[PDB]
Enzyme design. Structure first.
Site, mmCIF file in Angstrom:
data_model
loop_
_atom_site.group_PDB
_atom_site.id
_atom_site.type_symbol
_atom_site.label_atom_id
_atom_site.label_comp_id
_atom_site.label_asym_id
_atom_site.label_seq_id
_atom_site.Cartn_x
_atom_site.Cartn_y
_atom_site.Cartn_z
ATOM 1 N N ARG A 260 -12.324 -25.607 19.271
ATOM 2 C CA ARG A 260 -12.971 -25.922 20.538
ATOM 3 C C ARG A 260 -12.116 -26.855 21.383
ATOM 4 N NH1 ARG A 260 -16.127 -22.338 18.587
ATOM 5 N NH2 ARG A 260 -18.379 -22.673 18.316
HETATM 6 N N1 LIG Z 1 -15.593 -18.770 29.796
HETATM 7 C C1 LIG Z 1 -14.753 -18.846 28.742
HETATM 8 N N2 LIG Z 1 -13.440 -18.581 28.871
HETATM 9 C C2 LIG Z 1 -12.587 -18.649 27.833
HETATM 10 N N3 LIG Z 1 -12.970 -18.988 26.592
HETATM 11 C C3 LIG Z 1 -14.260 -19.279 26.319
HETATM 12 C C4 LIG Z 1 -15.241 -19.224 27.404
HETATM 13 N N4 LIG Z 1 -16.422 -19.553 26.871
HETATM 14 C C5 LIG Z 1 -16.224 -19.802 25.555
HETATM 15 N N5 LIG Z 1 -14.933 -19.642 25.230
HETATM 16 C C6 LIG Z 1 -14.374 -19.826 23.874
HETATM 17 O O1 LIG Z 1 -15.435 -20.160 22.987
HETATM 18 C C7 LIG Z 1 -15.263 -21.467 22.451
HETATM 19 C C8 LIG Z 1 -16.495 -22.295 22.753
HETATM 20 O O2 LIG Z 1 -17.644 -21.564 22.373
HETATM 21 P P1 LIG Z 1 -19.088 -22.208 22.587
HETATM 22 O O3 LIG Z 1 -19.750 -21.480 23.716
HETATM 23 O O4 LIG Z 1 -18.951 -23.702 22.633
HETATM 24 O O5 LIG Z 1 -19.796 -21.795 21.208
HETATM 25 P P2 LIG Z 1 -21.330 -21.353 21.109
HETATM 26 O O6 LIG Z 1 -21.487 -20.385 22.247
HETATM 27 O O7 LIG Z 1 -21.398 -20.714 19.755
HETATM 28 O O8 LIG Z 1 -22.118 -22.627 21.240
HETATM 29 C C9 LIG Z 1 -14.035 -22.084 23.080
HETATM 30 O O9 LIG Z 1 -13.148 -22.572 22.077
HETATM 31 C C10 LIG Z 1 -13.387 -20.972 23.868
HETATM 32 O O10 LIG Z 1 -12.171 -20.555 23.241
#
Ligand SMILES: Nc1ncnc2c1ncn2[C@@H]1O[C@H](COP(=O)(O)OP(=O)(O)O)[C@@H](O)[C@H]1O
Ligand SMILES: Nc1ncnc2c1ncn2[C@@H]1O[C@H](COP(=O)(O)OP(=O)(O)OP(=O)(O)O)[C@@H](O)[C@H]1O
Ligand SMILES: Nc1ncnc2c1ncn2[C@@H]1O[C@H](COP(=O)(O)OP(=O)(O)O)[C@@H](O)[C@H]1O
Ligand SMILES: [Mg+2]
Ligand SMILES: [Mg+2]
Ligand SMILES: [Mg+2]
Lengths: 188, 469, 48, 62, 498, 467
Positions: free
Chosen positions: E368
């Site tokens: 992350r």
């Molecule tokens: N809009 C986006 N553009 C690029 N990568 C993204 C985007 N949204 C999420 N990610 C990827 O997903 C990871 C974060 O996911 P996250 O949404 O925090 O997890 P969850 O949805 O399981 O809570 C980041 O490390 C990133 O690489």
């Protein structure tokens, strides 16, 4: 519900619940001593080999058991509390654990009149003078009005000293534990 | 009334009362704790005992500890003074800024609005996200879901929504972190402080935060959702105004409910969930509603354990939402972000009489072309692209262009992609997709459409690609 | 040398405890018991 | 401190062990058998060189 | 002679004080769980002691008896025994005195070497730091593996997850991370020194001995603690070892220092907890794990924080190790810990046997923090490498035109670049040099089977002739224009001369 | 002391002692039986009752029968006089040759070696088996494990290893047969008597046999592995020698536990297994280590229920082993024998710093080619081997040649197939696989490698095929 008066020492289990019911019933109206005496009486009454053989057979109907117990209670002139308790234990089929109730109430009554069971363990017996000073100091441990109930077992497994239990308080001046402690100190 | 702990097993405490019992759901305060431990009554076991779930660690409790009965459910401070603050389940502040000085305390347990209070009006809420606006448009006052497993974009998407809607939203806003990483809570606190929605100096804060992260015992995770919901409900009623309510995730409420059920004596159901899963979730999701007195726009992040949309928790949650946007891992692997699945997302307002016939027809054309693409992918696995009917290749090309064009760069995902955030007005999205379907771009390469705002940006990116060819 | 060091150390310990468990079998009774009740007095007066 | 009769008893059996350690008292055959066993194990693990002075190398140039 | 004397020195100081202590009688002992009767004032999860000096923890407080779990063997506890409450929640020693010492789950030295001189104790069950103490993750935690430092970077205060099957190379990544910190710990500045803690749960004592000797060989016990709750240790110890190690690391982060803790595995702490819970009679859950099996881990991995500069500035990274069954990441504990942690590092057997070691599946591995917690040089280079591998993976399943043929060539060159050996982590600047050479199309001329050669050789050249350039890259922490021009000429010269 | 039976459920007996209670693991003697019935204590139930597991059939036990405490756990005879004998759980000879005359008894419930006793040495043990030696090289002093369902080759492989390793072994050896066929134990006994490894009329016997075969109750199968462990431990610690400890089948040790766990009133865990599966397995398996006082090179045959490696028992055992050897039924159906799966099998000493660089490189090349073939198999099965590039066809041919070449003819199978047993020194194995990998033998037919010793035998077979 009826705000039952809690016993001093909480006994748990089936015997605990029946005994707490009996203690709450007796405490109001005030009949704890008489009901305890009647409980000790029924301790022997049911123990009679004929009665015991006729009450440990689950093929005599609960009706017959209740009728026989009513006859015995009337023949012995009990308080209505003890008669109702015996009837209740008979209806629920809890006769096989009747003594556990009388035992429980005893444990529950001894604490009511203030008693703290005690234990003393030594390699060998004691001379009555030393036992007297033990009585004195242990009564020092207790509070006010709390009679003591001493028990002096003899454990030769320990190599000397003394071990004393007062309720949950515990003091271990036995040679065995000192030997263990010093030996473990060496090895570290 | 005063009672007495008689058992402590995990997070479940059995308390015995010698006087009169406290009603179910009441809050009890343990006497003899350095901090504040609050138990909540959950059952009457007879013999004057009541079982309770502790809203905090039950370490250092002693069989016999006296307990006070507050006489009311957990009452949290509510009002305009909670804005810009942070709170526990029990309402005490955890932002290290002093007491919350309100005049109104609201109990976190309340009955849901009755049927004679429901608003029946729907009108699109434009979020600025192409896929959401086109295929699963949201609605003011409606409840939104964001399903998807772990690592697909739930948190990023919800942060993007807070960046857009909340920043330019007149009304207030509430954020309930339920059983999520505390790192993320701190990051959001600081991001809001930087943006300005949380103002530590004046009294102009527009966001109220409630947190019960995943270090908390199940009792607190199962109720921080109700605390945030109470704050939102107050802002809906007394303030009589629009509210937003973001929750992340609402699967931790269910899960925390499941971590104590077995200790409360209930036989487990289904895949080891509490027997009261649907009822417990309904008695909460039924207070997040747009009555005729106010209007809560509720966005919920819903963890889907192992991408399994048929799990009892997400499966049950599906019925409580107007719009859903099922983020998909199979699309996030491809690099299309946000990974919203265009075929597994739906909205209630998505009807020709609410959005318009042009919007509806564009959306349905996109969905149909994507489904046809899926049908073709099976054949391409045996033949190959070289052997397709010269019309089918056209379907595949349009489908790939549309698949890429749904991707968009967020202003909060600058760190990952490095690009710049784009907000695409609804008319521009409709025009872009209508043109892509109509064939007005069947010469630009696919990669021109990847991570761009309106369609003209795709044209410009294609021009740059050709010049540096 | 360290091996011999530790082996002799363990032998010392074992022999010493084997000898003490036999020495304690004597009868220092009155003295040790009087000290025990003295300790009981100390604990009692030091409790309340 | 002059009261813990077990304390001084252990110290006394200590002093006796000190004086009597002319040869490992109450050793028994296990003493020698072990000593030999781990001495041989250590010798095997280490080496067989001239366990007294520095053995010489006498290398060879490239 | 003096051996007996130092033996006496131990007696000379004893524990005369006998106190009046509360007690209880063991109603029933069996399977490692005692049911004491008494102990009315015993707290919850307090530490009690048995008549034989054996410890235990009062986990269940039922109205009629206290369910106690024994921290050790159970054959020595009889019925009607005596349990004395120590009046202290379970706590462990903490301090720099523990560094270089192998200890058991309760902080007792396990390698001889005397006792621990710890002057302070910390409760295992402490709450995680609030939302305010923390601060976003800034510094990088240098792991030494190229594929982890470049494609899935780890910061300080992050909670990575190493998840894979049996024998894919997880403990190897943990040991490489531990060994790499030697260069920083030997230096002078205290802002880079990272003290490592290794919690070994359910591993047979032989494995932990191999590991400890390996760390000693690399001279990495100067700053490592090893908390071993091996297989033969009662379940109440394998349950509690992660929390003991986490307290030993909380001590470091609470005092402005940095710590690294590596639970290995958490999938065995889960099993020990399940055994405890089933023998206390608590109702089972899914796959027989208790309901509180997520909490078990979430409360443990939430203690790996990054304190702000007001709270010392210290940090505590965590690298939990999970073990899946035939790659079924979708299992129960794997999914719990996946949704608890930050990044992940997926190791796959299909990649382990295909020659890619470490098997890090860069396609699925995530972090992350990503951008942040990466040095500027690595940030510059690994970005282009990430794009190149991302493009390569799409068109890899087969094996024409010049553009895509060269794309495959570059992808393969980078892939063979990312491979590595065991217990030989590389300094960040060396990784930057190698990855730069690989990604700037220089290796595209070479055959792929030879790439490894180049790699090795290249370093052994740069490590001697061009120490100044590597020092420049490290100190300035970026590939400046002059540094880039140098790197360019060095690589161009070396390629032809080889 | 003296207690009285109160309950007798299955193999679990409850005994009430009004006087002194016996500790746990302490053994008891049921007084009034034709033979010796030993009850190992397991729990204290309160009210002065102890639950116990019976080391023999409990039929004929009457409530109220008398039980006499023995004061110490099951103590077995250990020494050099237990070589050439056959023992059971409680140390009683079952070869009908007279009491085992030893002057030293050992309790079977000792504790595991501490941490300051482990030895870190890691040598290589050459077994003369191509697949085992190349990809999963066994180590001297380490724990080894053969995983495989029913009828895949566990016992044949372990008998081949007995033959080879324990013929070239100057030290002692101990075979503990826990929960296996009784006729297999008889065949082993007579093979050793014939092969000179046992002298019924001398004192030059080098194998001690312990046996708790499948016909015995669940209480005897559980506690026979401990008897074998004790007999081996004596030869390690005391005699300070290097021991071989073959076990077969160790799954039956955990299985037996799950049979009594149910009756001990414990909540079942994963698939009806006892809640204490991993702890019991650990306490058993950490006594088989090679410490500084000696060495034990234990080979354990482990049974995989329903061919399920996800089962809790094999899955837990995997973490207690240096080298594994996952025997596979799929491979065994192709005729390959031993059916070792080259990709599931692993080893700790497969390190270029222990085996070399040619050995390591060859092993990794073989594994890489086999993994590529496994990747192709799904397409090959449907689309056919014609939709493959030329590099892929070369990979398929090489991988099939290697798969066949890993098969070997054991001597213990001379009776099965009539072939001649073959040993293949390590250098010959490495050279043959080097040659196959380089492509030196692409003109031969793949069936020229099926079941041969060194590769030159494959070339001779191909020449004969040409005729
Ligand atoms: N809009 C986006 N553009 C690029 N990568 C993204 C985007 N949204 C999420 N990610 C990827 O997903 C990871 C974060 O996911 P996250 O949404 O925090 O997890 P969850 O949805 O399981 O809570 C980041 O490390 C990133 O690489
Ligand atoms: N980078 C590498 N290069 C070469 N070999 C490696 C590498 N990483 C791991 N291995 C090999 O993989 C084997 C297993 O390594 P490791 O113990 O790290 O995996 P593991 O999953 O922790 O094993 P287990 O889970 O069974 O403890 C080792 O024997 C080692 O030789
Ligand atoms: N090396 C071998 N050569 C030929 N056949 C074998 C070989 N190993 C096993 N088998 C076959 O397997 C059978 C023996 O299986 P076995 O291993 O004894 O069963 P288990 O796996 O239950 O021990 C034999 O009947 C034989 O046909
Ligand atoms: Mg999230
Ligand atoms: Mg490992
Ligand atoms: Mg067999």
């Amino acid at each position: 519900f009826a705000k039952l008066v809690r016993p001093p020492v909480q006994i748990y289990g089936i015997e605990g619940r029946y005994a707490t019911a009996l203690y709450s019933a007796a405490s109001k109206q005030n009949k704890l001593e008489q009901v305890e005496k009647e409980l000790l009486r029924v301790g022997q009454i049911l123990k009679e080999p004929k009665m015991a053989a006729s009450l440990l057979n689950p093929y005599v109907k609960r009706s017959v058991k209740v009728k026989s117990l009513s006859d015995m209670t009337a023949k012995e002139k009990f308080s209505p509390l003890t008669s109702n308790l015996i009837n209740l234990l008979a209806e629920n089929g809890r006769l096989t654990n009747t003594p556990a109730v009388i035992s429980a109430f005893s444990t529950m009554m001894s604490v009511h009149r203030g008693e703290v069971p005690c234990t003393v363990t030594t390699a060998s017996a004691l001379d009555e003078a030393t036992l007297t000073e033990l009585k004195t100091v242990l009564k020092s441990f207790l509070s006010k009005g709390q009679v003591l109930k001493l028990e002096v077992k003899i454990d030769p497994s320990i190599m000397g000293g003394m071990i004393v239990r007062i309720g949950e308080k515990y003091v271990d001046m036995s040679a065995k534990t000192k030997i263990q402690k010093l030996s473990r100190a060496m090895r570290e | 009334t005063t009672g007495r702990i008689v058992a402590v097993i995990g997070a479940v405490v059995d308390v015995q009362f010698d006087e009169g019992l406290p009603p179910i759901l009441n809050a009890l305060e343990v006497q003899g704790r350095e901090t504040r431990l609050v138990l909540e009554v959950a059952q009457h076991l007879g013999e004057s005992t009541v079982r309770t779930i502790a809203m905090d660690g039950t370490e250092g409790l002693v069989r016999g500890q006296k307990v006070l009965d507050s006489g009311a459910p957990i009452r949290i401070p509510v009002g305009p003074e909670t804005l810009g603050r942070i709170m526990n389940v029990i309402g005490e502040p955890i932002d290290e800024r002093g007491p919350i000085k309100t005049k109104q305390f609201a109990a976190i347990h309340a009955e849901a609005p009755e049927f004679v209070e429901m608003s029946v009006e729907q009108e699109i809420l434009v979020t600025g996200i192409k896929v959401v606006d086109l295929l699963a448009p949201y609605a003011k006052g409606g409840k939104i879901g964001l399903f998807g497993g772990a690592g697909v974009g739930k948190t990023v998407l919800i942060m993007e929504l807070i960046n857009n809607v909340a920043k330019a939203h007149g009304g207030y806003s509430v954020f309930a972190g339920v059983g999520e990483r505390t790192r993320e809570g701190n990051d959001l606190y600081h991001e809001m402080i930087e943006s300005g929605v949380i103002n530590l100096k004046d009294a102009t804060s527009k966001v109220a935060l409630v947190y019960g992260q995943m270090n908390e015992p199940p009792g607190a995770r199962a109720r921080v959702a109700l605390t945030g919901l109470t704050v939102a409900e107050y802002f809906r009623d007394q303030e009589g105004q629009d509210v937003l309510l973001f929750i992340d995730n609402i699967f931790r409420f269910t899960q925390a409910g499941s971590e104590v059920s077995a200790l409360l004596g209930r036989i487990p159901s289904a895949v080891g969930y509490q027997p009261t899963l649907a009822t417990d979730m309904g008695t909460m999701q039924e207070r997040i509603t747009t009555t005729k007195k106010g209007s809560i726009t509720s966005v919920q992040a819903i963890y889907v354990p192992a991408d399994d949309l048929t799990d009892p928790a997400p499966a049950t949650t599906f019925a409580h939402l107007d719009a859903t946007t099922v983020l998909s891992r199979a699309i996030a692997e491809l690099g299309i972000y946000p990974a919203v699945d265009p075929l597994d997302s739906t909205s209630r307002i998505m009807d020709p009489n609410i959005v318009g016939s042009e919007h509806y027809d564009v959306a349905r054309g996109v969905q149909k072309i994507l489904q046809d693409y899926k049908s073709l992918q099976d054949i391409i696995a045996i033949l190959g692209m070289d052997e397709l009917s010269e019309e089918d290749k056209l379907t595949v090309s349009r489908a790939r262009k549309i698949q890429r064009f749904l991707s968009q760069p967020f202003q909060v995902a600058e760190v990952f992609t490095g690009h710049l955030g784009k907000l695409v007005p609804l008319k521009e999205t409709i025009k872009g997709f209508q043109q892509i379907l109509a064939g007005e771009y069947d010469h630009l390469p696919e990669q021109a459409f990847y991570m761009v705002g309106p369609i003209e940006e795709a044209v410009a990116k294609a021009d740059k690609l050709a010049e540096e060819h | 040398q360290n091996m011999m060091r530790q082996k002799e150390q363990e032998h010392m310990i074992n022999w010493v405890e084997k000898r003490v468990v036999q020495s304690i079998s004597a009868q220092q009774e009155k003295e040790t018991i009087a000290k025990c009740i003295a300790d009981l007095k100390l604990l009692s007066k030091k409790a309340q | 401190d002059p009261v813990q009769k077990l304390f001084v008893d252990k110290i006394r059996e200590y002093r006796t062990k000190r004086q009597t350690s002319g040869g490992p008292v109450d050793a028994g055959p296990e003493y020698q058998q072990d000593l030999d066993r781990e001495l041989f194990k250590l010798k095997q693990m280490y080496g067989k060189a001239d366990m007294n002075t520095f053995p010489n190398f006498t290398f060879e140039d490239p | 002679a003096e051996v007996s004397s130092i033996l006496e020195e131990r007696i000379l100081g004893a524990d005369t004080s006998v106190d009046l202590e509360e007690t209880g009688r063991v109603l029933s002992i069996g399977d490692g769980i005692a049911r004491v009767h008494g102990l009315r004032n015993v707290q919850a999860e307090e530490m009690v002691e048995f008549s034989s000096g054996l410890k235990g923890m009062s986990l269940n407080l039922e109205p009629d008896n206290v369910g106690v779990v024994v921290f050790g063997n159970d054959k020595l506890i009889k019925e009607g025994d005596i349990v004395k409450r120590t009046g202290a929640i379970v706590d462990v020693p903490v301090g720099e005195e523990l560094l270089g010492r192998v200890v058991d789950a309760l902080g007792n030295a396990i390698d001889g070497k005397g006792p621990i001189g710890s002057k302070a104790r910390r409760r295992v069950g402490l709450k995680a730091p609030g939302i305010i103490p923390r601060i976003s993750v800034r510094e990088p935690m240098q792991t030494g593996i190229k594929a982890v430092d470049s494609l899935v970077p780890i910061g300080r205060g992050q909670r990575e997850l190493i998840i894979g099957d049996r024998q894919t190379g997880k403990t190897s990544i943990a040991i490489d991370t531990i060994i790499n910190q030697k260069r920083f710990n030997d230096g002078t500045d205290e802002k880079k020194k990272l003290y490592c803690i290794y919690v070994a749960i359910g591993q047979k004592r032989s494995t932990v001995a191999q590991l400890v000797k390996r760390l000693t060989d690399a001279d990495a016990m100067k700053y490592t603690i090893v908390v071993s709750a091996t297989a033969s240790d009662a379940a109440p110890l394998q349950y509690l070892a992660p929390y003991s190690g986490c307290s030993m690391g909380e001590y470091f982060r609470d005092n402005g220092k940095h710590a690294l803790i590596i639970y290995d595995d958490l999938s065995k702490q889960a099993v020990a907890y399940r055994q405890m819970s089933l023998l206390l009679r608590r109702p089972p859950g899914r796959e027989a794990y208790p309901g509180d099996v997520f909490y078990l881990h979430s409360r443990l991995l939430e203690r790996a924080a990054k304190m702000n500069d007001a709270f010392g500035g210290g940090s505590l990274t965590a690298l939990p190790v999970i073990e899946t069954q035939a790659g079924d990441v979708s299992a129960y504990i794997p999914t719990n810990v996946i949704s608890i942690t930050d990044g992940q590092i997926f190791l796959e057997t299909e990649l382990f046997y295909k020659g890619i070691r470490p098997a890090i599946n860069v396609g699925l591995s995530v972090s992350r923090v990503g951008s942040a917690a990466q040095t500027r040089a690595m940030k510059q280079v690994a970005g282009t490498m990430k794009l190149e591998l991302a493009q390569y993976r799409e068109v890899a399943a087969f094996a024409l035109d010049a553009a895509t043929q060269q794309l495959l060539s570059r992808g393969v060159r980078l892939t063979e670049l990312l491979k590595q050996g065991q217990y030989s982590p590389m300094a960040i600047e060396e990784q930057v040099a190698v990855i730069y050479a690989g990604v700037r199309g220089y290796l595209d001329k070479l055959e792929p089977s030879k790439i490894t050669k180049f790699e090795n050789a290249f370093l052994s050249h740069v490590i001697s002739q061009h120490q100044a350039l590597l020092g420049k890259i490290r100190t300035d922490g970026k590939i400046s224009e002059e540094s880039d021009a140098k790197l360019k000429e060095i690589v161009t010269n070396f390629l032809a001369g080889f």
